[PDB]
Amino acid sequence: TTVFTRILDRLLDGYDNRLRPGLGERVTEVKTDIFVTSFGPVSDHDMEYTIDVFFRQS
Amino acid sequence: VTVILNNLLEGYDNKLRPDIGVKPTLIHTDMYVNSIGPVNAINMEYTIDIFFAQTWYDRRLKFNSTIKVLRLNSNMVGKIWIPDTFFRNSKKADAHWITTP
Ligand SMILES: *[C@@H]1O[C@H](CO)[C@@H](O[C@@H]2O[C@H](CO)[C@@H](O[C@@H]3O[C@H](CO[C@H]4O[C@H](CO[C@H]5O[C@H](CO)[C@@H](O)[C@H](O)[C@@H]5O)[C@@H](O)[C@H](O[C@H]5O[C@H](CO)[C@@H](O)[C@H](O)[C@@H]5O[C@H]5O[C@H](CO)[C@@H](O)[C@H](O)[C@@H]5O)[C@@H]4O)[C@@H](O)[C@H](O[C@H]4O[C@H](CO)[C@@H](O)[C@H](O)[C@@H]4O[C@H]4O[C@H](CO)[C@@H](O)[C@H](O)[C@@H]4O[C@H]4O[C@H](CO)[C@@H](O)[C@H](O)[C@@H]4O)[C@@H]3O)[C@H](O)[C@H]2NC(C)=O)[C@H](O)[C@H]1NC(C)=O
């Protein structure tokens, strides 16, 4: 609706994605979470292993 | 800080190297080898993973402020002149793009 569209349009006005949040003010804290949907096959011939993950950062 | 970046990119031509008509551009290179992968004697090649760093000087990007250093992710890498460095004996080379460049 109108409120949704105007909120979305005006959110990034005057926003610089080149700078991290709290630049020059604090340290950017990122909370990380991993949900391993499937621990993929381990390749002995490559010293390699695959893992399918839902990777969440907040 | 946004003002500093806007001023630096304002009137900037990334098609031209620094000191284009003055002197050669001096680049200092560093390598950190994470792993020399397996050596394929059949193909006569070997895999290697590196952090490759290049340091140079660009007087176009001078700025006067109290910050003294702008630390940035890949976002502006395409907005300024970068060296044309390539590996002469590389059969195949790939950069990394997960999660970001
Ligand atoms: C024949 O035809 C083929 C097919 O068309 C063609 O192949 C294509 O070649 C072009 C290069 O000429 C290549 O395009 C570049 O790709 C860059 C990103 O990586 C892409 O590839 C990686 C890995 O793929 C490679 O893998 C192997 C090597 O490692 C090998 O197979 C190949 O080399 C292969 O390419 C891939 O992981 C990427 O996936 C995504 O993530 C990228 C993140 O940056 C994103 O750009 C991509 O769009 C893509 O995103 C979608 O998909 C992922 C999932 O895959 C999703 O997660 C996403 O949500 C998306 O849905 C890519 O495929 C790409 O970054 C290049 O674009 C950057 O650079 C150009 C050139 O400078 C700029 O014009 C672009 O604007 C962009 O630059 C911005 O970003 C960089 C940092 O990355 C900054 O430094 C810049 O400053 C700039 O950012 C600033 O400006 C922008 C606006 O301009 C702004 O938005 C920013 O905020 C900021 O202010 C470019 O697309 C292409 O991928 C490749 N196609 C293939 C292989 O299918 C051949 O060349 C043709 N041959 C001939 C001879 O004609």
Swiss-Prot record, chain A:
Top-rank taxon, per record: Eukaryota
Binding sites annotated in the UniProt record for 4-aminobutanoate: 56
Location within or outside the cell: Postsynaptic cell membrane; Cell membrane; Cytoplasmic vesicle membrane
Subunit (UniProt): Heteropentamer, formed by a combination of alpha (GABRA1-6), beta (GABRB1-3), gamma (GABRG1-3), delta (GABRD), epsilon (GABRE), rho (GABRR1-3), pi (GABRP) and theta (GABRQ) subunits, each subunit exhibiting distinct physiological and pharmacological properties. Interacts with UBQLN1. Interacts with TRAK1. Interacts with KIF21B. Identified in a complex of 720 kDa composed of LHFPL4, NLGN2, GABRA1, GABRB2, GABRG2 and GABRB3. Interacts with LHFPL4. Interacts with NLGN2. Interacts with SHISA7; interaction leads regulation of GABAAR trafficking, channel deactivation kinetics and pharmacology.
Misc note: Functions as a receptor for diazepines and various anesthetics, such as pentobarbital; these are bound at a separate allosteric effector binding site.
Role: Alpha subunit of the heteropentameric ligand-gated chloride channel gated by Gamma-aminobutyric acid (GABA), a major inhibitory neurotransmitter in the brain. GABA-gated chloride channels, also named GABA(A) receptors (GABAAR), consist of five subunits arranged around a central pore and contain GABA active binding site(s) located at the alpha and beta subunit interface(s). When activated by GABA, GABAARs selectively allow the flow of chloride anions across the cell membrane down their electrochemical gradient. Alpha-1/GABRA1-containing GABAARs are largely synaptic.
Domain notes: The extracellular domain contributes to synaptic contact formation. The GABA-binding pockets are located at the interface between neighboring alpha and beta subunits.
Similarity comment: Belongs to the ligand-gated ion channel (TC 1.A.9) family. Gamma-aminobutyric acid receptor (TC 1.A.9.5) subfamily. GABRA1 sub-subfamily.
UniProt disease link: Epilepsy, childhood absence 4: A subtype of idiopathic generalized epilepsy characterized by an onset at age 6-7 years, frequent absence seizures (several per day) and bilateral, synchronous, symmetric 3-Hz spike waves on EEG. Tonic-clonic seizures often develop in adolescence. Absence seizures may either remit or persist into adulthood. Epilepsy, idiopathic generalized 13: A disorder characterized by recurring generalized seizures in the absence of detectable brain lesions and/or metabolic abnormalities. Generalized seizures arise diffusely and simultaneously from both hemispheres of the brain. Seizure types include juvenile myoclonic seizures, absence seizures, and generalized tonic-clonic seizures.
Name the UniProt record assigns to this protein: Gamma-aminobutyric acid receptor subunit alpha-1
Species in which this protein is naturally found: Homo sapiens (Human)
Gene from which the chain derives: GABRA1
Swiss-Prot record, chain B:
Gene giving rise to this polypeptide: GABRG2
Annotated family: Belongs to the ligand-gated ion channel (TC 1.A.9) family. Gamma-aminobutyric acid receptor (TC 1.A.9.5) subfamily. GABRG2 sub-subfamily.
Clinical condition linked: Developmental and epileptic encephalopathy 74: A form of epileptic encephalopathy, a heterogeneous group of severe early-onset epilepsies characterized by refractory seizures, neurodevelopmental impairment, and poor prognosis. Development is normal prior to seizure onset, after which cognitive and motor delays become apparent. DEE74 is an autosomal dominant form with onset in the first year of life.
Record remark: domains: The extracellular domain contributes to synaptic contact formation. GABAARs subunits share a common topological structure: a peptide sequence made up of a long extracellular N-terminal, four transmembrane domains, intracellular or cytoplasmic domain located between the third and the fourth transmembrane domains.
From-to range in the entire protein, with total length: 66 to 166 of 475
Subunit structure: Heteropentamer, formed by a combination of alpha (GABRA1-6), beta (GABRB1-3), gamma (GABRG1-3), delta (GABRD), epsilon (GABRE), rho (GABRR1-3), pi (GABRP) and theta (GABRQ) chains, each subunit exhibiting distinct physiological and pharmacological properties. Interacts with GABARAP. Interacts with KIF21B. Identified in a complex of 720 kDa composed of LHFPL4, NLGN2, GABRA1, GABRB2, GABRG2 and GABRB3. Interacts with LHFPL4. Interacts with SHISA7; interaction leads to the regulation of GABA(A) receptor trafficking, channel deactivation kinetics and pharmacology.
Modified how: Palmitoylated by ZDHHC3/GODZ; required for the accumulation of GABA(A) receptors at the postsynaptic membrane of inhibitory GABAergic synapses.
Glycosylation sites: 64
Superkingdom as given in the UniProt entry: Eukaryota
Compartments, as annotated in UniProt: Postsynaptic cell membrane; Cell membrane; Cell projection, Dendrite; Cytoplasmic vesicle membrane
The protein's role, per its UniProt record: Gamma subunit of the heteropentameric ligand-gated chloride channel gated by gamma-aminobutyric acid (GABA), a major inhibitory neurotransmitter in the brain. GABA-gated chloride channels, also named GABA(A) receptors (GABAAR), consist of five subunits arranged around a central pore and contain GABA active binding site(s) located at the alpha and beta subunit interface(s). When activated by GABA, GABAARs selectively allow the flow of chloride anions across the cell membrane down their electrochemical gradient.
Protein name, as recorded: Gamma-aminobutyric acid receptor subunit gamma-2
Consequence of changing residue 41 to T: In DEE74; does not affect protein abundance; decreases cell surface expression; decreases current amplitude in response to GABA; does not affect zinc sensitivity; accelerates activation and prolonges deactivation
